[PDB]
Structures are given as C-alpha cells and as structure tokens.
Scaffold this active site. Sequence first.
Site, mmCIF file in Angstrom:
data_model
loop_
_atom_site.group_PDB
_atom_site.id
_atom_site.type_symbol
_atom_site.label_atom_id
_atom_site.label_comp_id
_atom_site.label_asym_id
_atom_site.label_seq_id
_atom_site.Cartn_x
_atom_site.Cartn_y
_atom_site.Cartn_z
ATOM 1 N N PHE A 84 -31.202 -7.490 -47.116
ATOM 2 C CA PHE A 84 -30.289 -6.361 -47.054
ATOM 3 C C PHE A 84 -30.644 -5.476 -48.232
ATOM 4 O O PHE A 84 -30.955 -6.048 -49.270
ATOM 5 C CB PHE A 84 -28.820 -6.835 -47.040
ATOM 6 C CG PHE A 84 -27.857 -5.666 -46.924
ATOM 7 C CD1 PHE A 84 -27.864 -4.881 -45.769
ATOM 8 C CD2 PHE A 84 -26.974 -5.353 -47.958
ATOM 9 C CE1 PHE A 84 -27.006 -3.790 -45.621
ATOM 10 C CE2 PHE A 84 -26.117 -4.265 -47.819
ATOM 11 C CZ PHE A 84 -26.134 -3.493 -46.653
ATOM 12 N N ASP A 155 -29.344 -14.725 -54.571
ATOM 13 C CA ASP A 155 -28.511 -13.821 -53.793
ATOM 14 C C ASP A 155 -27.979 -14.707 -52.685
ATOM 15 O O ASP A 155 -28.589 -14.832 -51.629
ATOM 16 C CB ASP A 155 -29.214 -12.552 -53.349
ATOM 17 C CG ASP A 155 -28.296 -11.633 -52.546
ATOM 18 O OD1 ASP A 155 -27.140 -12.017 -52.219
ATOM 19 O OD2 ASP A 155 -28.763 -10.543 -52.203
ATOM 20 N N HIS A 158 -25.293 -15.004 -48.021
ATOM 21 C CA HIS A 158 -25.277 -15.638 -46.703
ATOM 22 C C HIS A 158 -24.985 -17.163 -46.791
ATOM 23 O O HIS A 158 -24.876 -17.816 -45.747
ATOM 24 C CB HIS A 158 -26.738 -15.583 -46.163
ATOM 25 C CG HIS A 158 -27.214 -14.179 -45.954
ATOM 26 N ND1 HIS A 158 -28.434 -13.936 -45.331
ATOM 27 C CD2 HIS A 158 -26.686 -12.961 -46.287
ATOM 28 C CE1 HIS A 158 -28.596 -12.608 -45.289
ATOM 29 N NE2 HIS A 158 -27.550 -11.994 -45.837
ATOM 30 N N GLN A 181 -17.725 -9.434 -47.719
ATOM 31 C CA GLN A 181 -17.610 -8.296 -46.814
ATOM 32 C C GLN A 181 -17.303 -8.826 -45.426
ATOM 33 O O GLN A 181 -17.544 -9.994 -45.129
ATOM 34 C CB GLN A 181 -18.956 -7.529 -46.807
ATOM 35 C CG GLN A 181 -18.931 -6.316 -45.857
ATOM 36 C CD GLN A 181 -19.347 -6.661 -44.426
ATOM 37 O OE1 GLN A 181 -19.881 -7.872 -44.268
ATOM 38 N NE2 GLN A 181 -19.163 -5.888 -43.487
ATOM 39 N N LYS A 184 -19.138 -11.511 -43.350
ATOM 40 C CA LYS A 184 -19.616 -12.692 -44.054
ATOM 41 C C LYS A 184 -18.785 -13.943 -43.691
ATOM 42 O O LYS A 184 -17.809 -13.858 -42.938
ATOM 43 C CB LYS A 184 -19.641 -12.372 -45.551
ATOM 44 C CG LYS A 184 -20.470 -11.203 -46.042
ATOM 45 C CD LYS A 184 -22.003 -11.204 -46.035
ATOM 46 C CE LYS A 184 -22.549 -9.804 -45.794
ATOM 47 N NZ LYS A 184 -23.680 -9.464 -46.712
ATOM 48 N N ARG A 215 -13.601 -3.776 -72.054
ATOM 49 C CA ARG A 215 -12.393 -4.035 -72.793
ATOM 50 C C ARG A 215 -11.858 -5.447 -72.768
ATOM 51 O O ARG A 215 -11.544 -6.074 -71.726
ATOM 52 C CB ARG A 215 -11.356 -3.101 -72.077
ATOM 53 C CG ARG A 215 -10.059 -3.044 -72.878
ATOM 54 C CD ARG A 215 -9.009 -2.178 -72.188
ATOM 55 N NE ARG A 215 -7.894 -1.950 -73.085
ATOM 56 C CZ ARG A 215 -6.695 -1.450 -72.860
ATOM 57 N NH1 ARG A 215 -6.362 -1.058 -71.624
ATOM 58 N NH2 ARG A 215 -5.809 -1.339 -73.873
ATOM 59 N N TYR A 222 -7.289 0.140 -77.124
ATOM 60 C CA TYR A 222 -8.483 0.746 -76.507
ATOM 61 C C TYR A 222 -9.775 0.495 -77.263
ATOM 62 O O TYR A 222 -10.619 1.374 -77.451
ATOM 63 C CB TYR A 222 -8.282 2.261 -76.277
ATOM 64 C CG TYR A 222 -7.111 2.503 -75.344
ATOM 65 C CD1 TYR A 222 -7.186 2.097 -74.013
ATOM 66 C CD2 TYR A 222 -5.892 2.998 -75.780
ATOM 67 C CE1 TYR A 222 -6.163 2.287 -73.106
ATOM 68 C CE2 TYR A 222 -4.824 3.144 -74.909
ATOM 69 C CZ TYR A 222 -4.964 2.828 -73.574
ATOM 70 O OH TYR A 222 -3.933 3.081 -72.677
ATOM 71 N N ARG A 232 -13.346 -4.917 -61.021
ATOM 72 C CA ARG A 232 -12.258 -5.879 -60.855
ATOM 73 C C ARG A 232 -11.780 -5.978 -59.392
ATOM 74 O O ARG A 232 -11.727 -5.002 -58.652
ATOM 75 C CB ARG A 232 -11.095 -5.627 -61.788
ATOM 76 C CG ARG A 232 -11.342 -5.528 -63.296
ATOM 77 C CD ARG A 232 -9.921 -5.432 -63.978
ATOM 78 N NE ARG A 232 -9.330 -4.170 -63.446
ATOM 79 C CZ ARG A 232 -9.444 -3.069 -64.236
ATOM 80 N NH1 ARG A 232 -9.914 -3.179 -65.451
ATOM 81 N NH2 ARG A 232 -9.030 -1.883 -63.842
HETATM 82 C C1 LIG Z 1 -23.979 -8.347 -47.588
HETATM 83 C C2 LIG Z 1 -25.114 -8.573 -48.531
HETATM 84 C C3 LIG Z 1 -25.077 -8.168 -49.880
HETATM 85 C C4 LIG Z 1 -24.055 -7.219 -50.511
HETATM 86 O O1 LIG Z 1 -22.738 -7.317 -50.206
HETATM 87 P P1 LIG Z 1 -21.539 -6.286 -50.021
HETATM 88 O O2 LIG Z 1 -20.287 -7.096 -50.204
HETATM 89 O O3 LIG Z 1 -21.709 -5.876 -48.624
HETATM 90 O O4 LIG Z 1 -21.750 -5.210 -51.037
HETATM 91 C C5 LIG Z 1 -26.075 -8.571 -50.778
HETATM 92 N N1 LIG Z 1 -27.136 -9.294 -50.360
HETATM 93 C C6 LIG Z 1 -27.228 -9.737 -49.050
HETATM 94 C C7 LIG Z 1 -28.520 -10.516 -48.708
HETATM 95 C C8 LIG Z 1 -26.247 -9.395 -48.156
HETATM 96 O O5 LIG Z 1 -26.338 -9.745 -46.894
HETATM 97 C C1 LIG Z 2 -7.299 4.829 -65.423
HETATM 98 C C2 LIG Z 2 -8.225 5.956 -65.741
HETATM 99 C C3 LIG Z 2 -9.495 6.090 -65.147
HETATM 100 C C4 LIG Z 2 -10.235 5.019 -64.344
HETATM 101 O O1 LIG Z 2 -9.577 4.252 -63.440
HETATM 102 P P1 LIG Z 2 -9.676 2.740 -62.951
HETATM 103 O O2 LIG Z 2 -9.021 2.716 -61.600
HETATM 104 O O3 LIG Z 2 -8.860 2.048 -63.953
HETATM 105 O O4 LIG Z 2 -11.131 2.393 -62.954
HETATM 106 C C5 LIG Z 2 -10.249 7.260 -65.322
HETATM 107 N N1 LIG Z 2 -9.812 8.255 -66.122
HETATM 108 C C6 LIG Z 2 -8.566 8.193 -66.725
HETATM 109 C C7 LIG Z 2 -8.221 9.387 -67.647
HETATM 110 C C8 LIG Z 2 -7.787 7.082 -66.542
HETATM 111 O O5 LIG Z 2 -6.629 6.965 -67.151
#
Ligand SMILES: *Cc1c(COP(=O)(O)O)cnc(C)c1O
Ligand SMILES: *Cc1c(COP(=O)(O)O)cnc(C)c1O
Lengths: 384, 384
Positions: A84, A155, A158, A181, A184, A215, A222, A232
Amino acid sequence: KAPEFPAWPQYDDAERNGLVRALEQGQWWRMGGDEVNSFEREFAAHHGAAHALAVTNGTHALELALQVMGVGPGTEVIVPAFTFISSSQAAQRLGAVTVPVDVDAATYNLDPEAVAAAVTPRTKVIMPVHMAGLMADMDALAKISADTGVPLLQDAAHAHGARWQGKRVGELDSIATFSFQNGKLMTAGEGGAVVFPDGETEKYETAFLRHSCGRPRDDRRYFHKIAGSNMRLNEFSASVLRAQLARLDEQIAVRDERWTLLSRLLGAIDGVVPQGGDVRADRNSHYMAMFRIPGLTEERRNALVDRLVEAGLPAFAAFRAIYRTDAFWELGAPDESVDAIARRCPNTDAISSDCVWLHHRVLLAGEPELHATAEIIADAVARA
Amino acid sequence: KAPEFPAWPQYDDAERNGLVRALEQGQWWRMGGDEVNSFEREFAAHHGAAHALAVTNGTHALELALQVMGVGPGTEVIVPAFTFISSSQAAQRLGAVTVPVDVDAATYNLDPEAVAAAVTPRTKVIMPVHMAGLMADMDALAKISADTGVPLLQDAAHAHGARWQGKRVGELDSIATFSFQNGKLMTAGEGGAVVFPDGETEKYETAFLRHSCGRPRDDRRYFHKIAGSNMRLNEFSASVLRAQLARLDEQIAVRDERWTLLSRLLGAIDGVVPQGGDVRADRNSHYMAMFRIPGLTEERRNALVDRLVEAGLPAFAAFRAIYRTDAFWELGAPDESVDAIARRCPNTDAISSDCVWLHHRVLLAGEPELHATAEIIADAVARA
Ligand SMILES: *Cc1c(COP(=O)(O)O)cnc(C)c1O
Ligand SMILES: *Cc1c(COP(=O)(O)O)cnc(C)c1O
C-alpha cells in the site's frame, strides 16, 4: 445464486456499551479518559509487546515509528515495491528517499536477498510488510539487520494477531505498526498503533512526545520539548477497538480453516496460483485471500476483477508497483529511473498486474460459499 | 464555598443517538458512512464557507491547509509569537521557516504593523490566530495581503461561530482551520477542520486528495496521484460533532453575557487588565476568559495560577512565547537569535509571562459564581 458472505465490520453490544462508557466518562481525549490507555495495554499484551502507542491511523503510525528510528533528510528506507502506498509515503513525508525492493514470487513478501543488495551506507530502516497476514522472513531479515546494523520496522497493518516461529508481532526485536482502518482485521473506521518490543522504552517515550505536540503529559506551562505533530487517538475510537480486539483470535481461527479449503480450490484452477504459505509463520492472520493468474496484463486482470464483482464477489485488484504511481515520484524518489527500478523488481512488476484478492470477510463464510466462490472464479478465469 | 461551574465537555441524548446511528451504519470510515459527509456540510454552512474538510485534529488541519497553500522548503510562514505551538509546528513540519511576529498588547492578536515588516520575498502565508475567540484585524490584515500578495490562513481553533464585521469565518476570503480537541468550544475529544471560502474549490480538491493518501475517492486500482498522508476523520467522531455544533451559538451567547460581567469585575481589580475587545468583531466566541497582571514574572504568574486552582478555579498560565520553547528551535527556525526575536516581539515577551486564563466553562456559569470568581481573584492578586 450469488454466495453471501458475513458483513464487515462487525459489532454487537460490546461496541454499544463501549461507546456509552466512553461518552459517560465526560472526557473524550486520552488525557482525561481511560479507554485509550486501557486499549494500549490490552493491545500490547495481545501482541506480547512491552508498550503500545495508539494513534490516529496506520499511516501516521508508520510516520511516527520511522521518525523515532531516525528517518529523515539524507536517509534511505527500504520497503517492498508491492505494498500500500503509505509504506513509502511515510518515509517520503519525512524527507527520506524510498528504495523499493522486490518481493517473493510466492508469498509477495519482501525478498531477503533483494534487500541485502539495496542496502547502502544511507539505509536507515528496512521495512518488511506481512503481506495479507503472512509474516515476512523475519529470521533472514533479522540476520541482514544484524550484519548491516540497519534496524527493521514491521509494517504489520495486515497482521493483527499473527505469529512467526511461535512469536508474536511484538516479540521479534523490532518496532511494528498497525492500521485499524475500516476494512482491516479489527477496526474503528480509522485508527493505528505503534508497538514496541522489550528493550525499546526510550523510543516509546520519544514517540509519545512526538505524537502529542511534543508536550509532556502533565506540562502546565506550555513547555514543548521537541517538534512533531498531533497523532492522538480519541476515546470513542479506542473503546470500539477494545471490543474488536476481543474477537480477533477466533476470527483468525475461522479464517485459517477457510483459507485451507479455498487455497486448495484455487490451486486446482488452471492458471490460478493462490498466495503461497510458509510453515515458519505458524499463524497467518488472513487479512486478504490473494491469488495470481500469471501472464495476465493489468487490463485482463481488472476485467476479471470486474466480472467477479458482477457475480457477487468482493474481489479487488491487488496493489500496484509503488514505482508505477505518480505519488511515488512527487518527492524523495530514488535517482534510478522507472525501468531501472522495474528491472530489479521483476516479481513486483508481474504481481502488480497479475494479482487478485478477495475481502477477508469471505474467509468467515461457510465452506459451501467457498465452493460457490471457487466455481464463479473458475468460470471467469477461463474467459479472462 | 468554592464556586462550581458547568462541566465540559457537555452531551446528552443527541450524542448518544449519534454514536448509535454511526455504529449502525455498519461502516465507520467516511467512504462508507454519511456522518463525516453530513458534518462537513453542516459545519461549512454554519461558517458560511463553500466547503468544509473534516480531519483528524486542528494540528493536521493547519498542516494540510499550509501544504495546499504552497508552504514548503524555502518558504516563510508569519505567525503570532503568542499562540499554541501547533501554529508554528505545522509550518516547521513542512520544511518551512516560522517567522514569529508580535501581537497587540490588548487583544493579544497578531499585530498588523509587525507583520508588514516581517513580510519578505520568501513569505508564503500570514497566519492570524483569533485569540480566545476574538477575531484578529482581518481588515488591516487583508490590506497587507493585497499589497504583498501573501495569502492569509486563519487559525480559527478558538473561534468556532465567530464574526468579523457581520461576516462568518468562512466569509472572509481566506481558508481557515479549526480544532475540536476536548477543551475547545465544540469537541469529540479529538478532531479538526479546514474550511474553504467561495473561490477556493481547487485547493479544497487538492486538500481532500492530500488527506486521503493521495487517492481519488473511487479509485479501484491504487492510483495515487500525489503525496501526502491520511488525515481522515471517523464516523463516530463526526456524529458527536454534529450534536455539538447544534448547541454552539447559544453557548457563545451565554458566554458573551457572562464575559461582559466578568471583564468588568476583572478590570476593577488593581493590577488586572482583562483581554481588550474590538467592536468590529461583532461576535466573540469566548474560547478563553483571559487577563494580564502587567509586571508579574512567569514565576509570580504561575504561583498566582496555582493559588487560583487551590480556590477551585480552572485557571491556567497562558501560552508561552513560541520562541521560548525548545521545540521551536529544533527545526526550521529563523536565523535570528532568541533575544533578537524577543527584541521585536515585546508584547509577546510580557504576555508570555503575564497572562492568566480561565476555562470557557466558567463563562457558562451564573453571575453569582462570576462574582465569587472575581473576589477569589482579587484576593489572590493582592498577594501575588
Ligand atoms: C492500510 C495500510 C496502511 C496504512 O493504514 P491507514 O490506517 O489506512 O492509514 C499501511 N500499510 C499497509 C501495508 C496497509 O495496508
Ligand atoms: C488547539 C489549537 C490548535 C491545534 O489543535 P489540536 O486539535 O489540538 O491539534 C491549533 N491552533 C490553536 C491556536 C489551538 O489552540
């Protein structure tokens, strides 16, 4: 007449309760709830890893793993040329060069000898992909790794629940990545994970930091220590994944009995060669039911796929040589040319045009649908 | 005795039904369900934008927006020096240089004259941030934009539902980004969005492609056209966001009546200067209740914050000068020095040590808790 297969994804009350539990915590990100934290320990235990880092998706799990393993401007990452696009894309997003390497003709897994030759003084990571749930040759790959001093990154998108030589993904001595995803083997529509074997706690800490805007978990002023991103995973996704994890092993067991049947029905078809096995991979997760029809052009293969979809099968064309995508050449491409790359990736070059795959949901169906499935295929392949 | 404030996040049956609806679609990613698709149209309509692209988080919404607006190696992005690190981090992750610029002393918004001077032949994007929900000077910023030919990108993570001169975030003539992280004005624990004004459909298409592994929505043969990543939002998150959106305007209206009160109680405190207003921003979303205590070191400010937390207030230290974080200097930093940057960002330099903020949930409480809140603060500030 068309054989019907079980739905995917699947859920029941476990998912339902899970989403409610996540909601009712009143805090929906990992710093205020406990679903992500709990999914990480469960996931990591399930793979025998020391640590698991749940993230937004399998593409960012690769990006984060390559980054804590030093990938960046000036490096080369070796990846199978049949996979992929995320597998190369992740290296290329880091400023590294992706060096595509051939795969086995039978398992479609990264060829150990081809990697020994692409190995260079720039090579930062060698990245096997466990094609369709069948582990790559981690014994031979680990030897190359030892001789060059180039770490491996699995990787394992799968290969949820897979095993090599009685060992779990997280019990080899390498970092591995997964995807969750929608299509999967366990899913929350989106999601990913980085799993760290014993011995890699420092990289695990660095990855946590890089995935949370650099962080510290309980920084109040901060203080961003290092660069990165936000990768996250949210509490609702985690809770659906905890319910999916709990059915994984029994779903892999039903699939293994069905592949045994279907693999043999396929191999009895003139012109049809199902993915090969490997006795050292004692547990194949069966993410895809794959087969080649050697000699087919891409257009005959795609036409055979379309005809298989018209008879009710969830059939697809397999991946395309990564070097035959425009995305590959947009950034961090090697200084070889397209035919120079294809010259030394002959198996990929044919598999890229040859290979067909069925959705892993077909491997949860009963034997009779497997029988009906292989007749539909036998007919269509005679006419391809 | 301690004044109690409404919880955050908030939910009710809308969230509950939403999660079930998403689950029961049987397809949990945007390509098989309709929650993300529906949230995008609702979100975009709500901001008067032509298009909305829901993504994993506000950090990736900035990264994707800067990338379709040309940010990359060799460019400079102008950002306020007083903001959350993601604002620079996103440019720095793209290989660009982040040029921090001073902010107003009163609104803590990107100072229009400071940007006119940092403007350079390398400048690709100027990025106002609508500090705490109070829009930046989009009139003066748009003039600079017209004169230099440097497009603006609104970091509107604090400004869901906000308005400048009767116009919505999506009705200025710039791309804007939002966050839906747990403590933001609407949330699903994690989430983000890129919103495109009228006139920017090509960038909207490119962004869709870059956020989905550069693969056309109904590609069947793995044709990746361009590089990128995976920044797709999942159906469960989207469905909780659709329920959050529906209460936003009335939550911003309660907060505006409460800030009017609290702002005046704060300004009556010796040494205390609450964020200033701006009559041109006809609708302040009130993401934070911010105030400065000019003259305080960082350590006195942090100690005043700790004491405010001990009396029951959800008080925090404000952001830190981005140039005073180690993360800023790790990559794509300017060739100036730390004091060279601080020299020409004097307001940031003081606000970085001076400023305190209360969680926007305090602005949903009744007047009496606002009164109790300002007495707690009056006492603590005399002793700081
Ligand atoms: C699906 C897939 C990924 C990436 O996953 P996403 O969650 O779709 O970003 C990476 N490597 C392989 C071989 C995959 O099939
Ligand atoms: C929270 C924040 C972001 C980024 O957002 P996330 O969803 O936390 O990644 C970008 N710019 C400002 C000014 C923010 O307060």
